[PDB]
Design a protein around this ligand. Structure first.
Ligand SMILES: Cc1ncc(COP(=O)(O)O)c(CN[C@@H](CO)C(=O)O)c1O
Ligand SMILES: Cc1ncc(COP(=O)(O)O)c(CN[C@@H](CO)C(=O)O)c1O
Ligand SMILES: O=C(NCCOP(=O)(O)O)c1ccc(OC(F)(F)F)cc1
Ligand SMILES: O=C(NCCOP(=O)(O)O)c1ccc(OC(F)(F)F)cc1
Ligand code: NA
Ligand code: NA
Lengths: 392, 251, 392, 251
């Protein structure tokens, strides 16, 4: 039994070894209590404002939409301390860990952005941070690995399996199964077993709440659509949440199309995968015909989660949200375009969301539409990757 | 049915059961089939067999590598079921249980999975990442196909869980490594088999004395396999000596 | 003749070739008019808020001051779009360029931070940006050079002289002397010929204005001292400005001590140089006994300007502000300490300011003092440098 | 005094003055002294000499390199003044003007700098980065030591500036490369010498026709030096041919 519904339609659940259920139940109870605690909310708000820098700006991008009837705003999570939206929820989860009397933090990371966020939050709040990262990702994310260590976190390479994010996820779970007594597993996306999809959404909900207040102030109306990239689903559900009940507002999630859906080398399980059970949840996933879990390919390291948050799968099924895909090349073009025309270097993850907004504009230039793209992070971290590519 | 007969026969002999675990196809189909026959000839009262899975988030390093070795051999679920059919055709009474990960059971349909288990002769299925809380579809499909759904009774459990495991479990209750054993019996739970960390004969005798119907050992078994990869014959020899020792302790 | 005083005591002036005086006079007039134009102020405020992300947070650093009677706040210019305070004034200067009807931008840069700021501002406002950088700096700042090009700016390597910042400064002036008709020289610090020291201060003054409002709101009183690093003097005068008339507030500028003042390898001309005339101004400088201009050495690339803003030299002379120096090693320790205890990676430039605040605290642990350090920028750009060092 | 006598003598001959510019010590002390003597023997009416400075922000590539070459030779201001003393001791009437950067004049004291100029025999000093607006201390010190302060009359100037340059300048007015020339004469300004971009004899004749007292040429001179670095003799030969040609045009 649980206090909150672990499912979003058929998706979600708590598919973890019996040994980990007490940890999940404890976390859910702590979360529910924290949500009704004015003191907890005050502390969380204080950190978000005075440490992280909230609220983040809502920038109107006038140059890129010239010659069309599209008005585009960018929610600037790239300006948040750390460089990405990941910081919002790690601060909340860190406070939850402390509320439960835990002194250690376990985190998984692929691109390293959530890892850095977990490390900085742990440094600030006096938590012993342990981070698992696929050996293959460690090798290609030396900068982030150093930042994590600089901030006092222990980075542990995972050589098992494909040595990537999914393998790091498994390692985190196996560790937590025998340490939940003193350590909290700070999951980095809106996926995994209940209560994580719910907690991450609630601790990222300020993205959409701020966007709504800001767009009403600037345009006097709600957007026609809000657009966000979808790796695990946290930045997107953070943007979508406050708009779910505003039926006139379209919710568009963008999965990575990699080299193209038809090549099989992509990371779009929601629309091109098959439902399965892994990482503690029932959700669409990248898997073989036999049922073995596969990796998600994308030029962007952050859209590597081989599955997707259960709430996104649910919103898709009932038609509330629409999901599409953007290829490596389309993301690269959007990245270059924003740099040159707005002076903003977007994360390659976020570039997928921008690329789709640009498509909506370009395909129907005379269609009047107010769009908001969630700029989940800055792309200073992708400068080298983009360089190697263009140079090639 | 096979678990029922086994425990009844073991009870009439005042002895516990020793159940070894190994990954199917590790280090290869042929050698695995030989390993399994050796374990049986050595004294194994029952078998727990794992189907290679990409992300065994419930297994330590030893078994993680067993799966790695199995995959290196190209082992697939379909082949595992062919092996199971063969094993049953050779050994009609030994209980055979599978250790599965949820996606392999859910993949082509839960009912279909248990139906396949019944056709090849499997006796039980323990799905590692399916807690009692999410077990309904699984134990229902298991029962419909005369397969015993195995549940894990953790050490950090409570009365509520004990009652659930006792009413939902069949074949045997997987007791993670006393007081719980008594409670299970009080609630008419399936015979308890202690697992996790069992690597010595004394541990097997200890389990039986605590009131458990037997003990399960895997990593210790798998370690013998990995440390004799280059010596197929020696591997079997060592396996026989280990199982015989562990089995002797159950008497 | 001029509208505003070109001097701060004996320091300052307009020591440029006669050919460039009309450009300076035009700029001064445009600046004076812009300052009294509500429309210009509204536009500048709009960009600062909705594009750059102002106001920036004022973070209380509780972990680092544990066990002492020092309360330390960090003004978070590291959270500004671009990663440093440089963005504030480039936006203002870019608007000034447009106000004068100029379509091109000329900028000089050493570390590349001002260059990136100039490039992003030019991309946003539709200006053709040309940036001069010493060939030696170009070689060690490949990342920043790529960011500038990604944002459409032309980066021009300067091989003359020592091939560093001072040489880039000369090249910018020689270019502007024959193009001021269509191009504006966006100087990157509070130095150079009048009106630049004044314009840069005024376009950076919001740092101190915000800090005052924020500290009064949080502590109910003004700081005992505000501390900032001094390369050319822009981030420091931006912080100092609004506090100059608050006599109880100490103003402490920190110059780079490099390997130590006694080694001669430093960048502290204000307290250890000699007054001279170069780069259009009369100010203290790094120069030989003969009068040849020398380079400023520091582990931080941003504190490389071989002279210092004239207003700082003046504030020092009358005793309103005090200037000190911090060595490479002291800055490195401060960098590591902030990362590990507050989860903030500071620029190595800013680390000099933090290092001095830490010294003030550590030397007199029981002295009750409220300090504010200007965190001029983030240090993601210095990760590799710090790595190579610690690894060595 | 020397400029006064020169222009008076050139006026009685209805001819303009040709003034070459070179960097002191470029490419070396010895060769520079020889270059200077060649320029004089070739027809130079006066000389404009630069003192090597670290940051010549008012010079193009050609002269930037002249300074670079001078520094490579270890040339310093003190040595430049020793050279100047020698040059004057050999040539008593030729006007000698210096092209300086403000810090070299300000370094050891402005008054001291002009005093040194007077003692070695310098006739004028043009400080590149000191506009009329900042010139007070400099022209005052110049006048106290009988040194002519040279001012630049830019093409983008106006009446106000013309009046200032006319009243503050001495020796000759440096006219950056007609109407301005007339205004200067109207305001009793020092004779005008056109500079910047003068590299051909026709330009020299053109300047004199416009009403200028002569023309100054530097880069064209320096280019001959840099293109004959490996041929000291040829360098001088070329210099002589160039100066003679440019000088001939002033007649
Ligand atoms: C800027 C940015 N935008 C988008 C995403 C995708 O995740 P989300 O779908 O949870 O929002 C990431 C994820 N990053 C994950 C997976 O690699 C991490 O471990 O750092 C990101 O860093
Ligand atoms: C974060 C940060 N903090 C401090 C400074 C020093 O300059 P300031 O004294 O003008 O404030 C710089 C300067 N950077 C100059 C000089 O190299 C540039 O061209 O990018 C900086 O980037
Ligand atoms: O029996 C199996 N274990 C073999 C490990 O070796 P050993 O340490 O001797 O049991 C075994 C049993 C249950 C299981 O799932 C979960 F972890 F969730 F409980 C995983 C492996
Ligand atoms: O006479 C000198 N110029 C030599 C350059 O060669 P040329 O092009 O032939 O004059 C000369 C004169 C003035 C000067 O300062 C400033 F630029 F500000 F006016 C710099 C060089
Ligand atoms: Na995904
Ligand atoms: Na300096």
């Amino acid at each position: 039994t649980t206090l909150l519904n672990p499912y979003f339609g058929e998706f979600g659940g708590m598919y973890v070894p019996q040994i980990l259920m007490p940890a999940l139940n404890q976390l859910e109870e702590a979360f529910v209590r924290a949500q009704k605690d004015p003191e907890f909310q005050a502390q969380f708000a204080d950190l978000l404002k005075n440490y992280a820098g909230r609220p983040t700006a809502l920038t109107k991008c006038q140059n890129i939409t010239a010659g069309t009837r599209t008005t585009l705003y960018l929610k600037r999570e790239d300006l948040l301390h750390g460089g990405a939206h990941k910081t919002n929820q790690v601060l909340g989860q860190a406070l939850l860990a402390k509320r439960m009397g835990k002194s250690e933090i376990i985190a998984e990371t692929g691109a390293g952005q959530h890892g850095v966020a977990s490390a900085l939050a742990s440094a600030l709040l006096g938590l012993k941070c342990r981070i698992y990262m696929g050996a293959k990702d460690v090798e290609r994310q030396s900068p982030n690995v150093f930042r994590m260590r600089l901030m006092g976190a222990e980075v542990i390479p995972v050589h098992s399996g494909s040595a990537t994010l999914k393998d790091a996820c498994n390692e985190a779970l196996r560790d937590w199964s025998g340490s939940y007594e003193t350590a909290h597993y700070m999951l980095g996306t809106a996926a995994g077993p209940h209560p994580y999809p719910t907690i991450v959404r609630e601790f990222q909900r300020m993205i959409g709440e701020e966007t709504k207040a800001q767009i009403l102030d600037k345009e006097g109306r709600l957007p026609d659509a809000v657009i966000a990239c979808v790796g695990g689903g946290s930045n997107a559900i953070g943007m979508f949440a406050d708009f779910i009940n505003d039926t006139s507002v379209g919710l568009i999630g963008v999965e990575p199309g990699g080299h193209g859906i038809e090549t099989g080398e992509h990371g779009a399980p929601l629309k091109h995968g098959r439902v399965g059970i892994y990482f503690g949840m029932k959700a669409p996933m990248m898997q073989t015909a036999d049922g073995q879990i596969e990796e998600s390919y994308s030029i962007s390291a952050g859209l590597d989660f081989p599955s997707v948050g259960p709430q996104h799968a649910y919103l898709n099924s009932i038609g509330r949200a629409d999901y599409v895909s953007i290829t490596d090349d389309e993301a690269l073009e959007a990245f270059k375009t924003l740099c040159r025309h707005e002076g903003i270097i977007p994360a390659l993850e976020s570039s997928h969301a921008l690329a789709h907004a640009l498509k909506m504009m370009r395909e129907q230039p005379e269609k009047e539409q107010l769009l908001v793209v969630n700029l989940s992070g800055r792309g200073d971290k992708d400068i080298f990757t983009v360089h190697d590519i263009l140079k090639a | 049915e096979r678990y029922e007969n086994l425990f009844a026969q073991l009870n009439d002999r005042r002895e516990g059961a020793f159940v070894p675990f190994v990954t199917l196809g590790d280090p290869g189909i042929e050698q695995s089939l030989k390993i399994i026959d050796t374990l049986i000839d050595a004294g194994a009262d029952a078998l727990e067999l794992g189907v290679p899975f990409s992300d065994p988030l419930a297994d330590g390093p030893t078994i993680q590598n067993a799966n790695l070795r199995a995959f290196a051999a190209g082992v697939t679920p379909a082949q595992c079921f062919e092996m199971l059919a063969l094993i049953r055709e050779k050994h009609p009474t030994i209980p055979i249980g599978l250790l599965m990960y949820a996606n392999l059971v859910f993949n082509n349909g839960i009912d279909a999975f248990y139906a396949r288990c019944e056709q090849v002769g499997v006796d039980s299925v323990l799905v590692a990442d399916v807690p009692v809380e999410e077990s309904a579809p699984f134990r229902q499909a298991a029962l419909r196909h005369n397969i015993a759904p195995i549940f894990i009774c953790p050490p950090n459990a409570d009365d509520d869980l004990l009652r659930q495991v006792a009413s939902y479990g069949r074949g045997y209750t997987y007791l993670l490594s006393h007081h719980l054993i008594e409670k299970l019996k009080e609630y008419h739970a399936a015979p308890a088999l202690q697992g996790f960390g069992i690597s010595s004969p004394e541990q097997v005798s200890a389990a039986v004395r605590a009131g458990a119907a037997g003990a399960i050992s895997g990593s210790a078994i798998v370690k013998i396999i990995e440390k004799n990869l280059a010596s197929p014959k020696q591997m079997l020899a060592e396996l026989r000596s280990f199982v015989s020792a562990m089995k002797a302790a159950s008497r």
